């Protein structure tokens, strides 16, 4: 009886276990830390004797992932495309797609310019995927405390000033909000500086997160697209922007949105209908409506990034693909 659930459990059949799985998992953890700034806890491996090849991932002892690999599962390719086809299944909780390939098909797919995993790697490519879906569950008050203690080696004055400006709960909330939107918190020096700059003039954690996002726009654009090539952008029309802006209500803890269920459902439906034509799109809205749009779209569309006009500079061309726009619904259908 030890209070506190074990953070990370990976349960595997004895066949799936390998001698190099530990180092492979550690390398995946180091890659995730470098890519996101979130230091993950150690993965606890549990060998489960089972005739059927099954693997499960439990976060804090709650099963979040389960998958039975087929008997022919020897080469794995995350995602789907035209050049590769065969033995494709969709992972639960809308993580993405996985394809199982034979040796020659895996070789030709690797030659095509894709990553193919064999052996223990196939486990990591799965675990990493799951770990990428629940990153925000690994950054809280204690983890923020750990990051701040680590930052005191070279930035003792910065950490002291940040603590002078904000309590640890607000810092943890800001870091968690950043992590939940796939924004890396690797650059703690810049994030802490931005929080110090804006804390006296702003008490709302959501607005502080928006300011930090603006300060990190270089990294956000670098991660969204490695190259300067024009990636498609879907603009939110002025009708939706004003509809969501008029719903902003301010209380002592900051501003929230007060929109009807019909409105949110119709914007979500039209956005989803406007997302099926291409694999990836970036939704761009105004500065004062980006966070509210995200929080009314994060429940269903979690993997789509919501960008703000201030988050893209004037040195990047926009290549607008579509322009989604609607007016109110309850008062009058209007555009909807």
| Binding residues for a second copy (CB under 8 A) | 1-5, 29-30, 33-34, 37, 39, 60-64, 93, 140-142, 145, 147, 150-151, 153-158, 161, 165, 168-169, 173, 186-190, 193, 196-197, 200-201, 218-219, 222, 253, 299-300, 313-315
- Residue 258: CB minimum distance to a second copy, A: 15
Q: How far apart are the first and last CA of the chain?
A: 57
Residue number, 242 or 310, with CB nearest to a second copy:
310
Residue number, 77 or 135, with CB nearest to a second copy:
135
- Phi first, then psi, for residue 141 (nearest 5°) are -65, -45
- Residue 313: CB minimum distance to a second copy, A: 8
Question: What count of residues does the chain have?
Answer: 336
Helix and strand numbers (H, E) in the chain are 12, 13
Q: Which residues contact 154 (CB under 8 A, 6 or more apart)?
A: none
- Residue 144: CB minimum distance to a second copy, A: 8
Provide the edge-to-edge strand list for the sheet that holds 282-285: 306-308, 282-285, 233-236, 320-324
Structure tokens at 269: 């439906």
- Residue 106: CB minimum distance to a second copy, A: 26
- Residue 287: CB minimum distance to a second copy, A: 13
How deeply is 190 buried, as exposed, middle or buried, from its count of CB atoms within 10 A (0-12, 13-18, 19+)?
middle
- Residue 194: CB minimum distance to a second copy, A: 10
Residue number, 106 or 195, with CB nearest to a second copy:
195
Residue number, 201 or 276, with CB nearest to a second copy:
201
- How far does Cα 247 stand from its chain's mean position? 26
- Residue 334: CB minimum distance to a second copy, A: 26
Among the listed residues 313, 318, 332, 204, the one whose alpha carbon sits nearest the alpha carbon of residue 262? 332
Residue number, 18 or 61, with CB nearest to a second copy:
61
- Residue 155: CB minimum distance to a second copy, A: 5
Give 64's Cβ-side CA count (13 Å radius): 23
Residue number, 83 or 142, with CB nearest to a second copy:
142
Residue number, 154 or 273, with CB nearest to a second copy:
154
Cα separations (Å) of 12 from 58, 101, 133, 135, 313?
Answer: 12, 21, 20, 22, 47
Distance between CA atoms of residues 231 and 220, nearest Å: 14
- Residue 140: CB minimum distance to a second copy, A: 5
Q: Where are the beta strands (DSSP E) in 60-210?
A: 62-68, 75-78, 88-90, 97-101
How deeply is 60 buried, as exposed, middle or buried, from its count of CB atoms within 10 A (0-12, 13-18, 19+)?
middle
- How far does Cα 82 stand from its chain's mean position? 26
Residue number, 68 or 72, with CB nearest to a second copy:
68
Residue number, 5 or 118, with CB nearest to a second copy:
5
Residue 99 DSSP label: E
CB 202 within 8 A of CB 208: yes
């Amino acid at each position: 009886m030890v209070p506190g659930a074990c953070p990370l459990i990976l349960r595997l059949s004895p066949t799936l276990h390998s001698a190099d799985l530990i180092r492979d998992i550690d390398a995946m953890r180091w890659f995730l830390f470098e890519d996101t700034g979130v230091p993950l806890p150690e993965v606890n491996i549990e060998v489960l004797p089972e005739p059927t090849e099954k693997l499960t991932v439990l976060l804090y002892q709650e099963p979040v992932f389960s998958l039975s690999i087929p008997a022919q599962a020897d080469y794995l390719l995350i995602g789907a495309d035209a050049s590769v086809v065969g033995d494709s299944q969709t992972l639960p909780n809308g993580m993405g797609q996985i394809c199982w390939l034979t040796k020659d098909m895996a070789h030709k797919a690797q030659g095509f310019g894709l990553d193919v995993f064999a052996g223990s790697q196939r486990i990591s490519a799965l675990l990493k995927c799951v770990l990428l879906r629940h990153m925000g569950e690994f950054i809280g008050v204690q983890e923020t405390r750990y990051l701040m203690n680590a930052m005191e080696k070279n930035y003792s004055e910065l950490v002291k000033e940040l603590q002078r400006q904000l309590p640890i709960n607000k810092i943890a909330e800001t870091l968690q909000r950043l992590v939940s939107e796939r924004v890396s918190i690797r650059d703690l020096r810049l994030i802490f500086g931005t929080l110090i700059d804006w804390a006296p003039r702003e008490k709302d954690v959501l607005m502080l997160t928006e300011y930090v996002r603006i300060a990190l726009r270089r990294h956000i654009l670098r991660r969204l697209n490695p190259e300067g090539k024009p990636l498609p952008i879907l603009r939110i029309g002025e009708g939706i922007e004003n509809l969501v802006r008029e719903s902003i209500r301010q209380t002592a803890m900051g501003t929230y949105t007060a929109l009807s269920s019909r409105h949110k459902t119709q914007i979500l439906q039209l956005i989803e209908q406007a997302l099926k034509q291409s694999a990836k799109l970036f939704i761009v809205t105004s500065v004062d409506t980006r966070r509210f749009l995200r929080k009314i779209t994060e429940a269903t569309l979690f993997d789509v990034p919501i960008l703000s006009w201030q988050e893209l500079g004037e040195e990047s061309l926009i290549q607008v693909v579509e322009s989604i726009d609607l007016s109110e619904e309850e008062l009058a259908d209007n555009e909807e």
